[PDB]
Design a protein around this nucleic acid. Structure first.
Lengths: 155, 60, 45, 174, 194, 76
DNA sequence: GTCTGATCTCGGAA
DNA sequence: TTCCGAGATCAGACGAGAT
């Protein structure tokens, strides 16, 4: 059987030509699947092209890790790559951005806006010295001692 | 030889500016639980450890 | 009226203080070489 | 560096108590973690929590039950339905609960294929007695097979609040 | 060549069947021979569909770059027929002044715009694109309640996404995505639109 | 009533976390202990005997909660 | 000493 | 007629730790 691979980028102009069944054609550029084939196909390439390059190098990995990394990367509308720039479009809190790169601009710009951040995540609860709520700090514990909301006295 | 490299710091000098334990064994040490080992302590889910290991016994 | 339209939440700060006519000097306990840049100001002041 | 960028975005995710995986700000990333809500750590090979061939042979060897009838193909599919809707197996989502059923009939046909060659099960008595140990699946084992495959499936869920993205950042980065 | 002037008509009558109109089944599937009735004429607009709901109005303007005047050709027959939704399936693209003329006349008539080579494949039947299903108004309220979620906080798909632009979805709607898996095949995810 | 009836490894850690620190401040011990001086080793003796005066407050992330006694859970 | 998205200037067109 | 595409220049960053 015959197929043909191209070294190009114009996807939907390739997908629409005569002879190519455009229902079965993929890319490896996850942006040109996002612009052309929706976000959900751009989720499946980020699953695939990581799980393709991970089994190529030996290096077995669960899909449930890549099913999380892809689903974080494309859940706010568009594919948000994990760079310095994609963190600004993913997170609201300042100190989690400020502990990452560009510490100067991210602290001044969030003083220009009156940015009220709550203290959540782990990159701020570690900075502030609060027990983080991720993991062992998710729930909280009660005590089971002898108590009751009692009757009062007659006044 | 391990005599030049054996090291432990219970509680000693802190740096004058940031009040963290100093860097070096010549200055009675304290070894940096770095931010890469922070994520290891995150991924275990140990929350009360990280408060103990980065607020209680470093900068209380 | 036009302070929130520049997105400055005016409970945090109005735009008149984006520029400096006074300046806080940091306390001495957080500088036991930035002191040298402070005295270079008051020389020029 | 690629370890650092990965974990500085993915650190504040944890599978909440209603099985959803949310960000720190409350926004949902995944509705169940990874479709089934299962630990990759506890996950068995082939990305399946059980690998049912290994567990059934383990059950036959830990519990060989002599003096037991071991009749099959007419009772095996009948015991595996009487046990499976019996006050239990509600928390098993029926994508796994199909997968036991397609495996049980897959080993139900393996019995009848041997009993096709010889050894009729007319009441469980032929004259060479050894023939009933060809594919022995006796109903003390198949009920212990289900109570293990349930509990191995229930145990290997994603424990709620488990720094789910922080596991992901190590497992991509390493 | 005509693999287009036909499959485009095949695609939009798959498209407006998915969006819930009443296209009779024989009008849906045509082989090329059923469209060879007109096949020699149109290369050397004779192609315009009106279909109603269980009413859109597609357009194939033969101009490559549709200008404002070309929209204004059927701005008037848009408001003449009392039709509310339209489609403008273009050859090259719109002129960069003409796309505002859509959003200037936004809440009166809808008139979404597609390219030609965007429409030459049905992206719904693509193997990578899973089955998006637009959910009803009461299908949202049983979603939010089960997960105890506010309308915001759901995963989000853009409004200009190729599958949202396919299904014709305004802001505020929630699609249900059935992502196929290997152990289950029914990995269901939802998306609020932007 | 809707969360998992299995005590997670993050709940076993903190229940052993605070029942160790409670019993290291002279709490009343529930297990009539047999010479264990490490307070953490007393707490695992408390868990296996299923006598810990602690109720886990499990927070569903909307804000609603759901209590769970440590007696009322399936440890590993 | 590049790799980087952003943000500024030019230009050809309905 | 204006507006959006495409030409230049500009950014902050470039693993742990150790003596």
């Amino acid at each position: 059987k015959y197929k043909l691979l191209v070294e190009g980028d114009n996807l939907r102009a390739v997908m629409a030509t005569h002879g190519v069944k455009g229902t079965r054609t993929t890319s490896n550029n996850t942006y040109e699947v996002e612009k052309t084939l929706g976000i959900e196909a751009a989720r499946t390439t980020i699953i695939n092209e990581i799980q393709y390059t991970m089994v190529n190098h030996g290096m077995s990995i669960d899909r449930r890790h890549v099913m999380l990394l892809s689903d974080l990367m494309t859940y706010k509308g568009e594919v948000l790559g994990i760079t310095r720039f994609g963190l600004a479009k993913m997170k609201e809190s300042v100190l989690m951005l400020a502990s990452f790169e560009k510490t100067a601009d991210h602290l001044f710009d969030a003083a220009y806006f009156g940015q009220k951040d709550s203290v959540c995540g782990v990159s701020e609860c570690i900075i502030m010295g609060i027990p983080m709520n991720i993991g062992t700090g998710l729930f909280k514990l009660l005590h089971k001692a002898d108590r009751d909301p009692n009757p009062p006295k007659r006044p | 030889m391990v005599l030049d490299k054996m090291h432990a710091r219970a509680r000693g000098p802190r740096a004058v500016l940031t009040r963290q334990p100093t860097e070096g064994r010549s200055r009675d040490g304290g070894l940096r639980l770095g931010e890469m080992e922070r994520d290891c302590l995150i991924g275990y889910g140990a929350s009360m450890l990280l408060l103990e290991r980065l607020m209680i016994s470093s900068d209380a | 009226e036009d302070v929130p339209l520049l997105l400055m939440n005016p409970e945090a700060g109005k735009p008149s203080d984006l520029i400096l006519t006074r300046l806080l000097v940091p306390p001495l306990c957080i500088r036991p070489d930035l002191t040298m840049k402070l005295t270079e100001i008051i020389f020029l002041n | 560096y690629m370890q650092r960028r990965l974990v500085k975005s993915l650190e504040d995710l944890c599978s909440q108590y209603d099985l959803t995986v949310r960000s720190s700000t409350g926004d949902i990333i995944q509705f169940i973690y990874g479709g089934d809500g299962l630990d990759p750590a506890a996950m068995e090979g082939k990305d399946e929590p059980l690998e049912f061939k290994r567990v059934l042979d383990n059950i036959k060897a830990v519990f060989p039950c002599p003096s037991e009838p071991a009749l099959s193909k007419n009772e095996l599919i009948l015991t595996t339905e009487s046990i499976m809707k019996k006050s239990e197996f509600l928390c098993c989502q029926d994508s796994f609960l199909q997968e036991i059923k397609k495996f049980i009939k897959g080993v139900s046909e393996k019995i009848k294929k041997t009993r096709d060659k010889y050894g009729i099960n007319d009441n469980g008595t032929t004259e060479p007695r050894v023939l009933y140990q060809l594919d022995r699946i006796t109903p003390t084992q198949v009920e212990k097979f289900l109570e293990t495959c349930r509990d191995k499936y229930m145990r290997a869920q994603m424990e709620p609040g488990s720094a789910v993205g922080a596991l992901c950042a190590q497992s991509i980065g390493e | 060549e005509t693999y287009r002037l036909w499959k485009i008509r095949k695609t939009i009558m798959q498209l407006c069947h998915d969006r819930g109109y009443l296209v009779t089944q024989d009008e849906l599937d045509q082989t090329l021979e059923e469209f060879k009735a007109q096949s020699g004429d149109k290369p050397s607009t004779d192609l315009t569909v009106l279909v109603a709901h269980n009413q859109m109005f597609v357009f194939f303007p033969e101009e490559p770059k549709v200008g404002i005047k070309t929209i204004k050709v059927y701005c008037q027959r848009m408001q003449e027929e009392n039709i509310t939704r339209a489609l403008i399936v273009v050859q090259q693209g719109m002129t960069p002044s003409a796309k505002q003329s859509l959003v200037d006349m936004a809440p009166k008539y809808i008139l979404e715009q597609f390219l030609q080579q965007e429409l030459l494949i049905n992206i719904t039947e693509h193997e990578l694109v899973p089955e998006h299903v637009v959910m009803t108004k009461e299908e949202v309220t049983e979603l939010l309640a089960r997960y105890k979620l506010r309308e915001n906080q759901l995963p989000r798909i853009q409004a200009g996404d190729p599958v949202a632009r396919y299904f014709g979805i305004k802001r505020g709607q929630v699609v249900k995505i059935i992502r196929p898996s290997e152990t289950a095949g029914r990995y269901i995810t939802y998306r609020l639109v932007q | 009533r809707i969360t998992t009836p299995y005590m997670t490894k993050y709940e076993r850690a903190r229940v052993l976390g605070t029942r160790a620190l409670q019993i290291a401040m002279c709490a009343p011990v529930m297990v009539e202990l047999e010479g264990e001086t490490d307070p953490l080793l007393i707490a695992m003796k408390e868990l296996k005997a299923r006598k810990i005066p602690i109720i886990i407050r499990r927070y569903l992330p909307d804000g609603s909660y759901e209590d769970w006694g440590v007696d009322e859970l399936i440890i590993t």
